[PDB]
Every structure is written in structure tokens, then in C-alpha cells.
């Protein structure tokens, strides 16, 4: 995906819940830094709901393909609110851009 273009989006519908830099506060929502191979419900300080803390899945391309097209659908009960992204492409390239700024 495009990093760029997946900047573009994370600002304009992830950022005002959500940092990704190493060290980065949490806010409504954790702090992404080191969410790629990491099982759900493990940013350190954050307090989860048991379903987030239970779906016990791995973070990648494709559980992040699956789980940004539909929050509630893939953790039910999650008090993330969000109602999804539809579209393929704007996934894939927020994906790519979080590859990128979690691991930096
Ligand atoms: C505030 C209104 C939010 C917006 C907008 C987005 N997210 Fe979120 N997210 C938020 C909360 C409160 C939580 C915790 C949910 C819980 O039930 O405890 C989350 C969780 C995530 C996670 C999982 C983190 C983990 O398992 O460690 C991811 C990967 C995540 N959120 C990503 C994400 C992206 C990419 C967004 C823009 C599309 C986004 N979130 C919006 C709060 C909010």
C-alpha cells in the first residue's frame, strides 16, 4: 500500500483516538507502537475491555484487513467506536502506513 496515502487517513479517522509514536500517549484509544506480531490487549497502561483483551488473535495485514472493515463484527462489545473503512484500498494503504509508523 501507499505510506503516505495512509498517513492521510490514520489523521483523519484514527489519529483523534489513537498515537503511534514509541513512547506516544494514550488517549481515547492505546498507543499503537509495537502492535505488529503482538496479540490483542497488550499496550502497557490501557485499560481494555475483556473483549478486546480476549480475542487473542495476532495483529497483521490480514487480521488488520479484516478488523478495520468492521470493529464491532470482529470484537464484539469493543468500545472502540468506529464504524469501519469499506473500502479495500484506503485499508490497505493505512495498513502500510502503520507497518511504518508503529516500527519506527
Ligand atoms: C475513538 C473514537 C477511536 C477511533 C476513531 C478509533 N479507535 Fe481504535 N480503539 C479505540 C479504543 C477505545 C480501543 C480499545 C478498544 C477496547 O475494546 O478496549 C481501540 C482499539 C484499537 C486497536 C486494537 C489495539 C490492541 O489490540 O492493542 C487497533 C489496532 C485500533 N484501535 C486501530 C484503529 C485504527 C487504525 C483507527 C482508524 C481507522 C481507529 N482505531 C479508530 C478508539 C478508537
Redesign the pocket.
Same mark, same amino acid.
Given at each position: 500500500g501507499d505510506v503516505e496515502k495512509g498517513k492521510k487517513?490514520?489523521v483523519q479517522?484514527?489519529?483523534?483516538?489513537?498515537t503511534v509514536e514509541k513512547g506516544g500517549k494514550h488517549?481515547?484509544?492505546?498507543n499503537?507502537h509495537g502492535?505488529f506480531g503482538?496479540?490483542?490487549?497488550?499496550?502497557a497502561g =490501557?485499560?481494555?475491555?475483556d473483549?478486546?483483551?480476549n480475542?487473542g488473535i495476532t495483529?497483521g495485514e490480514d487480521t488488520?484487513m479484516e478488523?478495520?472493515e468492521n470493529?464491532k463484527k470482529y470484537?464484539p462489545?469493543?468500545?472502540?467506536? =468506529?464504524a469501519?473503512?469499506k473500502k479495500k484500498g484506503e485499508r490497505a494503504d493505512?495498513?502500510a502506513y502503520?507497518k511504518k509508523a508503529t516500527n519506527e
Open positions: 487517513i490514520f479517522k484514527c489519529a483523534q483516538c489513537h488517549k481515547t484509544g492505546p499503537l502492535l503482538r496479540k490483542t490487549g497488550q499496550a =490501557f485499560e481494555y475491555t473483549a478486546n483483551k480475542k495483529w488488520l478488523y478495520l470493529p470484537i462489545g469493543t468500545k472502540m467506536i =468506529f469501519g473503512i493505512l495498513i502503520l
